[PDB]
């Protein structure tokens, strides 16, 4: 939690341009908590209250919608505000090229609709999310894939037989819900282990073309920067072209 907040405040302070940005994407993170918190803080500041009052915040589902309202920020919809200025969100893993695995919380669809509608997309995470090189290195649970519910047998068959997935499960709802997770868009989630992914761009397209697949947890050529919090208060940043700094 320590690390999570560190990354978030730097991400907002360095990238949110009070002169340029009005439509802000707020993601489904447990790290974004501190993004919404930071933005909320600017609204409590007499210096920025007037400009921050006018920010319209676009959610990526229910926790996100909640984080916005609870921070007293204006809540908009992506349908009314389709051109987003800047979006902040978490990630389940980030690779050396700022390709992401997302969807650990089953909200990958609206996360991607928002992030790919944004001029700038910023990821905020704790340092464990930063892979030595490839997606699928430390996030071992699979690429989340949102699917039409009637297709779960077909999609599982295709992922195994055509795409050579190593492991494919329809995500179940645990103690909160018996049987399959249903998303905010009324879909199922498959978690598909592909091992370490060397060509995530190619992998995404292959999964996306499948009959039954709604969207993948692979976010490709989208994030412009990722901020990673350390417990020790420090923050590392990954940018495009393999450039990284503290």
């Amino acid at each position: 939690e320590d690390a999570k907040r560190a990354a978030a405040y730097r991400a907002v302070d360095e990238n949110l341009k009070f002169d340029d940005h009005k439509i802000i994407g707020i993601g489904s993170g447990s790290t974004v908590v501190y993004v919404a918190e930071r933005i909320g803080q600017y609204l409590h500041d007499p210096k920025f209250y007037e400009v921050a009052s006018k920010f319209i915040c676009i959610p990526t589902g229910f926790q996100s919608r909640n984080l916005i309202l609870d921070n007293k920020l204006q809540l908009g919809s992506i349908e009314q505000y389709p051109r987003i200025d800047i979006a902040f969100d978490g990630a389940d893993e980030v690779d050396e090229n700022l390709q992401l695995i997302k969807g650990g919380g089953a909200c990958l669809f609206q996360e991607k609709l928002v992030s790919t509608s944004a001029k700038t997309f910023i990821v905020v995470a704790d340092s464990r999310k930063k892979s030595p090189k490839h997606l699928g290195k430390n996030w071992r649970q699979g690429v989340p894939i949102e699917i039409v519910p009637s297709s779960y047998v077909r999609v599982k068959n295709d992922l195994l037989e055509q795409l050579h997935a190593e492991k494919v499960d329809i995500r179940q709802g645990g103690s909160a819900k018996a049987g399959p997770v249903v998303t905010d868009n009324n879909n199922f989630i498959i978690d598909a282990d592909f091992g370490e992914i060397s060509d995530p761009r190619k992998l995404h397209r292959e999964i996306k073309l499948l009959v039954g697949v709604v969207e993948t947890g692979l976010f490709i050529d989208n994030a412009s920067k990722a901020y990673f919090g350390n417990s020790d208060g420090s923050v590392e940043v990954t940018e495009k072209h393999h450039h990284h700094h503290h």
Copy 2:
């Protein structure tokens, strides 16, 4: 698990009438596992295989659908088989009048559609489910209530303000899903604590009449018997009119 299986085998053996019953409701239990198992066993028996081959099993959602198929039983739909002969299911709590709290797994709607379509409804549970007297005694988490998603503020307001609920939460999906649980019928779940419920019949009607409420986890005048497993291998049975035996 011990206790759970004990109750299940007696429930089936004593109540499933191979001469009379063809359409069988199979519930969303973690105790029903052993009901489907028991029924499956009769199908592996040369004596009963021919009759049990012809059973059509009606599920109460995805685990249930799964338990049926995995036990090699014929799978039907409630729409095609609306008159069910006998249904078996679990319960989160059972009172002295065989009124039930159900919905701990968020499948209360299809559980009730099936159980109230059945001539006979049998509950199978471990002994912890058997209340000293009232619903809400040992199940402290609230009556599950399935609601239209846009209504969660309204329904919460009505439950608190009109019905004097003690605690009202929209169930969240835990680590499997960020934000609210979505059911198999695309709805939300509210868990509403009403304390110990002295008139569950009255309570059910009041909740059911609310704008936003789809169905309640209160199963009223439905169960004809409940079987309760003890670890010690013993099985207690509650029947109508406060009659109970081993």
Copy 3:
């Protein structure tokens, strides 16, 4: 269309209180078009622009959401604005006691969630909607009933067998969609003919208690006034206690 607009402008002018009302319910009408239009006109007026700029308009689904935006009014959600000051909507039929049949457009659920969240509810219609006495007199197509999709056989059976409905059909989608209409809340619609309905309050409760029923198109003790347009430009008003005037 003539008549429809007449009723709408009087309804708004006489009932929208610029001093008292800020949260306005806008219904799913083809007559409400002219309600949203009228409200929009006040926003184009330098006298009222500042006050009308601050109105927050709560939709009852997609046409409604559209009418609001296209009239340049602020769009809110019922979840964020649960206490509505005044709501305007259409009706498929109105009886002498201002009980309504609604749901001809399959939006009855969100229509009722909004209208019953409002301090004041005003109906706007053309004169054909005004029954000589009872609901079911000139609207012959049935009471719309929103139902959980898996329950359509059960609900039809109950409506016929328990409630003695005269005719029960699951509404089909016509040329736009093969098979059953699916609502904005992912439900089916049954249209149930009960003939002329002498006790709509009793009828509503009976349908609402059924397993599978989400909400009914019977709006009971909700509307405080109804405005009816004539082609001839005239407007008749029905109020509580059988009082009617031009």
Copy 4:
């Protein structure tokens, strides 16, 4: 209706192999009516009753499910029977290479899930469906595209801006439902006019990769034959490699 039935009976008689085929896909046609009818007729025949009794018929949504049951055929689900032997369905237009436009009834998703799960796919239509050359020649209403509901602005923007669509509309529900059609999979439908489509394979992939797109009405390299009924009782057949005959 005349023409529609002609095509259907020949399609079944020539392609349904009572020795080889057990799992049969039944489509969402208004022409398939006569396919299900024909199959049903074989079940009324003492010669074929025993073999046809064992056919399991996989539906492509509600009319289809209905056609199966009403013809007394066994009803299965694609999840339980994922490998389909032969599927029959209609089409909104067929080109010279047996590429199809489908989705006029908003059931394109489950139609494609079924047809692409089949070893053999046969189209049955009246002669108006047979384009002189290209898709989009006589079907002028657009390629149906199933989309996640929150994405309708984004998808419309992408179709116009990236793919140069000529016309893009979110399909509305007509008199049966105010606002957007919702499909059996809880999605919206966009009808996108691309004019006459010279490379439907390329077009399908481009639309399918879009954020918000669930599935397209472009069925590519799927149909092995198409039967076209004439009023005059005659039937024309298109096969692979531009081969056509009566």
